[PDB]
Symmetry: C4
Subunit: 336 residues, 4 copies
Amino acid sequence: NAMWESKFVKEGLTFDDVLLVPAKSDVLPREVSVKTVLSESLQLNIPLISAGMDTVTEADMAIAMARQGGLGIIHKNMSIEQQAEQVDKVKRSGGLLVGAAVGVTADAMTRIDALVKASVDAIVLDTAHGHSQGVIDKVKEVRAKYPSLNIIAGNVATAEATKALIEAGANVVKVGIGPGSICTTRVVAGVGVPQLTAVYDCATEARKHGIPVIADGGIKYSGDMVKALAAGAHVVMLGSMFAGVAESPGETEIYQGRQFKVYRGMGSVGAMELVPEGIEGRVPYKGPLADTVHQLVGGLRAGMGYCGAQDLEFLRENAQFIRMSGAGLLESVQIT
Amino acid sequence: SNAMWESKFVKEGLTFDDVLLVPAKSDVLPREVSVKTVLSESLQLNIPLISAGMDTVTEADMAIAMARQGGLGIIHKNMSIEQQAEQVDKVKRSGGLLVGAAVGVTADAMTRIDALVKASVDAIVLDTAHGHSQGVIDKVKEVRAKYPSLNIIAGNVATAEATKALIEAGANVVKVGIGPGSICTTRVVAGVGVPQLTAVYDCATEARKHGIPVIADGGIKYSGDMVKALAAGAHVVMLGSMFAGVAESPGETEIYQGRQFKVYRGMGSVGAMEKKLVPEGIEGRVPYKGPLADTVHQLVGGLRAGMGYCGAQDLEFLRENAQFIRMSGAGLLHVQITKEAPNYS
Amino acid sequence: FQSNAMWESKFVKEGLTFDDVLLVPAKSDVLPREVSVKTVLSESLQLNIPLISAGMDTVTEADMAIAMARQGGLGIIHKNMSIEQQAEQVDKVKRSGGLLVGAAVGVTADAMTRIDALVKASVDAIVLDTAHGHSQGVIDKVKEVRAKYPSLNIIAGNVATAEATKALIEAGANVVKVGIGPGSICTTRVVAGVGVPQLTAVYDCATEARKHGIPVIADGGIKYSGDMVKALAAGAHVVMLGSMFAGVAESPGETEIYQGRQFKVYRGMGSVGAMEKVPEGIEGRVPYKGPLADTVHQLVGGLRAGMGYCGAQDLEFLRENAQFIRMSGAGLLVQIT
Amino acid sequence: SNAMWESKFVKEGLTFDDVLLVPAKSDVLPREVSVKTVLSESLQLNIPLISAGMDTVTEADMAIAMARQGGLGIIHKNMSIEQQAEQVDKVKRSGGLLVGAAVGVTADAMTRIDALVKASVDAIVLDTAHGHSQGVIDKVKEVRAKYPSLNIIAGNVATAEATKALIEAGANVVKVGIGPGSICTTRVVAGVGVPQLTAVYDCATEARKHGIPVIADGGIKYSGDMVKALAAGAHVVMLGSMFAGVAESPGETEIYQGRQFKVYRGMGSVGAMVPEGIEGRVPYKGPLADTVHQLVGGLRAGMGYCGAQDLEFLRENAQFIRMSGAGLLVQI
Ligand SMILES: Cn1nc(CC(=O)Nc2ccc3oc4c(c3c2)CCCC4)c2ccccc2c1=O
Ligand SMILES: Cn1nc(CC(=O)Nc2ccc3oc4c(c3c2)CCCC4)c2ccccc2c1=O
Ligand SMILES: Cn1nc(CC(=O)Nc2ccc3oc4c(c3c2)CCCC4)c2ccccc2c1=O
Ligand SMILES: Cn1nc(CC(=O)Nc2ccc3oc4c(c3c2)CCCC4)c2ccccc2c1=O
Ligand SMILES: O=c1[nH]cnc2c1ncn2[C@@H]1O[C@H](COP(=O)(O)O)[C@@H](O)[C@H]1O
Ligand SMILES: O=c1[nH]cnc2c1ncn2[C@@H]1O[C@H](COP(=O)(O)O)[C@@H](O)[C@H]1O
Ligand SMILES: O=c1[nH]cnc2c1ncn2[C@@H]1O[C@H](COP(=O)(O)O)[C@@H](O)[C@H]1O
Ligand SMILES: O=c1[nH]cnc2c1ncn2[C@@H]1O[C@H](COP(=O)(O)O)[C@@H](O)[C@H]1O
């Protein structure tokens, strides 16, 4: 009963537990490189990805997002004809990078072939529990058929889970069980892993093979995104921070004179229409997408200025965190 | 020796909110998992739930509904021996269903237990605030001598030593929990208690040795807290606050702010004792939930998902192989959640 | 060789308070209402119940001190009055039933004068309260008194330290008062950044006062019945309450109505108001709780239950055998009516 | 290698609210303690309080009132060079008092230092969000090269390595703080910061091997926090928020919801110039001396418990005890 013993040993860290420690710097924030590479085929100018959710990313979002340096993932709560159409639309809008989300359905192989012929750069094979034989075998089918296609599998929270996917044929791994804003996995199932600890553990596995890791969910401030990138992620993925953007799908509701967008989990009652592990909410209208990106990539250049990082690689390997108490982060006057 | 003096502050405690389950390799879907459990040779549940023997939570109706779902009801003991034997027999008249009844450590305890046996009760629940007592121990021995085949659920405890005590006194099952109840003020009035997750783990660890199942009793708010409990060594969880608002629970529904409410009170509360006192329970109100079946579906639904993340095809696999990860207070905690308007009727 | 010990040890010590721990149940076949809560501070000083009301002008005067003694406890009459009036408050208590009584004196020039008046008034114990008991002036004050009154019960405080407790014991003190900072009306921790978590302070103090068989008093920080149990179980013989007794019928001062609700004034001795008749006390208000008896009945009832879970027949077993478990903030966490 | 990779989450950090000061044996009455302090042969303060170099906190009126309480004011740089040099001289002619002036790491830096030295300023404060840069080190070396006896205060830093590097560039005094500030959002926008107590200790531990003092800057909300910061190795502390609402502070009283407030904002906020400071309001605290009285009042109290006759005893002998959140836990 070795297992009985290790039940409560492991320990986890979230974004609010740590801070990056400043180091010797001779590179200015405006001078750094926030560029990143997921593969030969996938090169990003800014390490940002919009989430494959029906309230975050359609063709307009992926186009806006591509034009910024990043990448959008067309959600799959759509007919196959429609998704390939939106993919083909983004692709021909200047030869932009687009990604698309595929379920681990029976139909998935059919959906993937439509997306490949519409010329997607990367498909996202995402499910709630990416450490399942269903997903492993599914990746190996897709990899057998398309040995050059960028595959992003998830979701995973552990290194053994990460290893299983890399060997199945995954060249990018997506991290996060529990942490998303609209996520209720932990409340309803008791399951999940602190996102910083998740990213670090998974990155430590992927680092050996040289595979990029996506941090997905739980990000609220540019700060948390700098932390995700220094914890080992190549790239972060946002839902709530883009849902209120002008280029996301769906229109602007007005309630009491204030502008709002709907943001909901893909496993909430709406996106499904087996208990729900997603919820439905509203987010404030944030206007143009460029506004949100400028702030995020600005904050990133500051953090990398503090850490002495010229590029994201220097950041991932050398950056040092410091742990604190909860008392600690109340240290981060009524405001106008 | 001061060995007791310098060990005053060594032990650490964990509760539900300190931990999360860690996803593992899984080949099993939530709909194919087995939520069956065997408390004993004679007593088997189709779902790991037991409604608590409280006068606001469980009577004959709730036991019948609980059984129908594949769980078990514990008919509370705030009533005559005659009218509790009434309720026991009624559950058995309704399709030979499994039913429990609570019996406190008293003088009339045996007179009460007897009547229950003649009504063909499946399990008797020996409940005391402090189960780690000779008084309780020698009462469990008395019942085992007179009824060798009777299921005995004896509690409550929080330590391994208490556990092995009741097992060797002839109890089939141990009910774990000092202080974690929603309506419990034992931790405030007496400064006494163990964080439930540690108490379960500690008690189960001793009880596995004897092949004895334990029950996690109290402190469960969400369904995820229940997955956490089962995964910590418990065979079955016990619920009061979540079953109180349910329509099949004892008590009139009351209207406040147009909303309907039901009364949930501790058995150690002032009102419950009246059916110079230092109470260790409080009276409150919980919202009307509706039918029992809708509440159970969400609980079991969250269990299956949780077992699916862990790769447990059965509850025994979860008990033995599941792994927790500890977080800080920050770890337990933009988008405004949209909740639909209420039903006034 | 220059030592770097002090510099490196700056952040090593760790502290616990009441909310940080819970008591673990043990085997126990003593019922709560059959436990002995009798306690012995000295042969001269025996209490039925382990309770002492604080020497504050908002908490303890004659009528209060009578009430406490009669419940089996003890009142420490406060020193914010003339010597002549303090000694007459002590007399009134002493001659109504032959009750035990305490009396507060500060380390001052006219302290010795006050003590004799109080000793002549047949006081059972005097309490030498200073904000910092580990001072040379306080230590020399205790030798000064022990020398002249070798039969007198002396309580010296406040201390937070094992050293400090050793220091006051060696000066001749029968009983030690423990507490720097944990007061409800205290702002020492905020205006000066000084203090020790009450549970650790007690534990660390009693650890030293055990070697000499000297009792300690847990001074402040108790908000709930269960926190008193935690104090006694950490090494204290007795506990001193202020806030809890301040809003009681036998308290000095009358009942004020605030938004149609009955209240009483409770203020620190270091607050501006007490000082006139930099502050490290503030003034507040506490709910009117009625007569002392019901508050004592719930605090003693709460101890009885605690000793019942722990298997403690008497306060000595609890003090020597009770084991705690540490929890976290989430472990400290329905519509109550 | 894998060394940097495994060191990522190893370090722990403490802030003011994490700890308290352990009362030791005491000979000393609060009124008899010496709160005097010496930065430099050139520079000495009767109290350990330095007024922050911000457009919301300090100008010539504030600097004068600081000096006359026993401390120091640091004239901010959001002004013309000869406007700043005129502020420095107005304080100088107001009774031969102590003044400092903030200076940025730019090309006009040396041009502005020439004017400030011309008005006989005592110390300059080279302030940057990131003092551990080659820019600041190179600037310090070239000022130390030209003005060898000018007191140079350099920062901010948060580490020993940074502290060491500035001492070897020529800084007499080292300023410590990245994140702790009340108007600071560096933690939130860049995820970067170091808990102040751990920072001052780690920076003092390196500084006292050179006889170099450190300033603890920001995060101070209580007098008890100042006692804590001095006891972890700081000679002197710098305050912004607790000085913004006083009368001698730049601007004047303004009214929100019919109460009196004074605007208080960071130098990296939108107004004072991506933002890392914010803009807000603090209550009109009244005159400077009343606030100073309560601060130094608190310090005498804390030195009393710890038994420190002077700030050196405190710095070398004070012991902390760590606690939890429930440890930092009557209608007042
Ligand atoms: C996070 N999440 N969760 C869900 C619910 C869900 O699928 N939960 C869930 C929980 C646990 C699960 O455990 C396993 C699986 C699994 C799935 C799949 C295969 C066997 C192992 C969801 C449902 C529909 C659409 C989207 C989502 C979704 O995004
Ligand atoms: C803290 N802070 N930040 C800022 C903005 C700022 O300079 N941020 C910033 C962030 C990150 C930074 O990282 C580096 C540097 C740097 C600067 C400079 C040296 C190289 C490394 C500020 C701007 C104007 C006036 C005052 C301030 C200021 O006080
Ligand atoms: C927690 N609690 N407490 C009480 C009051 C109570 O009995 N408290 C209590 C406290 C502490 C106790 O300690 C012991 C015992 C005991 C009992 C009995 C056996 C010896 C040791 C209660 C009363 C009736 C019904 C239920 C309860 C109850 O659930
Ligand atoms: C907590 N407290 N503090 C105070 C203020 C106070 O005395 N503070 C204080 C602080 C620090 C102190 O340090 C010492 C002493 C001392 C005193 C006494 C002499 C030895 C060294 C107080 C004053 C008058 C009456 C009551 C009180 C009081 O109860
Ligand atoms: O239905 C849901 N339940 C739980 N997680 C979800 C659901 N829908 C999306 N997610 C995850 O949550 C992330 C968005 O979280 P956010 O970035 O914090 O808003 C997505 O990238 C998904 O990985
Ligand atoms: O008055 C009481 N005081 C303390 N615990 C109680 C009292 N009444 C019931 N309990 C326990 O609390 C459990 C219910 O806790 P809950 O599921 O969190 O609401 C019951 O099954 C009992 O074991
Ligand atoms: O003004 C003061 N400042 C700090 N502590 C005080 C002051 N006055 C009384 N005390 C202490 O506070 C205790 C009361 O604590 P309470 O029971 O939590 O309110 C008394 O026992 C005194 O020792
Ligand atoms: O704009 C800003 N962003 C971040 N920190 C600042 C800014 N302006 C001033 N500071 C720092 O914050 C200190 C004052 O912090 P306070 O005493 O908590 O208000 C100053 O002395 C500076 O070191």
